[PDB]
Design a protein around this nucleic acid. Structure first.
Length: 226
DNA sequence: CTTCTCACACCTTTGAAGTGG
DNA sequence: CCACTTCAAAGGTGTGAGAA
């Protein structure tokens, strides 16, 4: 059998781990009863938990260029859909002490509405009023510049929806419309744009070349290879 | 005639508990 | 305590036929 913890239990365990890396029997016991768990489960968790001018760099840019020169298409679902390739970046030139906030947003590329026929995209009208507006704040926000610069920053959890009445907080886009992602860095007491990451939101794939590019590169689509 | 929705097979990832050091 | 690994559920993908 498999046992899962509550978002509450996990979060509280996470909040303490960010304060203390090790616990003592009394510290372990008191937390367990608060979390309505046994001391052993808490014990195991912490053991398990222990392992594992500003310049921004888009990693795996090569894969984006592969998609880019073909015409980047992105699937949007009512429930929300991941971006492939994943928007991972490395940031440098930050203040180690200063706390920052990383977030993403996706703005319209143009003012046209496209369609795909005979291996060709064509403006078949004006862009629909793209509303409302939503941002994607990175989970690790807010954190010090030292944390952001420590390793890569992954925006892979970002999900895309076509549901204008989405109750989950995913960035809402209009299907059959071209879009451009933007990275923003803010403080607490700069915008970086990559034209190659520009895409078109779709409800289903058009050019199978894009489709083939995804399958041979997306680990989850490994079930569809020859 | 276009564009969007859904179950299902197939896959990776995840996390707590297990084992031995 | 470490560092591995089980093991089953969770989650991500695209496909194809049907739906507004």
């Amino acid at each position: 059998p498999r046992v899962l913890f509550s978002q509450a239990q996990v979060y509280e365990l996470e909040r303490r781990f960010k304060q203390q890396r090790y616990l003592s029997a009394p510290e372990r016991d008191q937390l367990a009863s608060v979390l309505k768990l046994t001391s052993t489960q808490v014990k195991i968790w912490f053991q398990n938990r222990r392992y594992k001018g500003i310049k921004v760099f888009l990693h795996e840019r090569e894969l984006w260029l592969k998609f880019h020169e073909v015409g980047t298409e992105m699937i949007i679902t009512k429930a929300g859909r991941r971006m492939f390739p994943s928007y991972k970046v490395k940031v440098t030139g930050l203040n180690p002490k200063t706390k920052y906030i990383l977030l993403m947003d996706i703005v319209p590329a143009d003012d046209h509405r496209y369609k795909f026929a005979d291996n060709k995209w064509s403006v078949t009208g004006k862009a629909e009023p793209a509303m409302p507006g939503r941002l994607y704040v990175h989970p690790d926000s807010p954190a010090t510049g030292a944390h952001w610069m420590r390793q890569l920053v992954s925006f892979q959890k970002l999900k895309l929806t076509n549901n204008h009445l989405d109750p989950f907080g995913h960035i809402i886009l209009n299907s059959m419309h071209k879009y451009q992602p933007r990275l923003h860095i803010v403080k607490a007491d700069s915008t970086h744009v990559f034209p190659e990451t520009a895409f078109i939101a779709v409800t289903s794939y058009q050019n199978h070349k894009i489709t083939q590019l995804k399958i041979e590169n997306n680990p989850f689509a490994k079930g569809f290879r020859g």
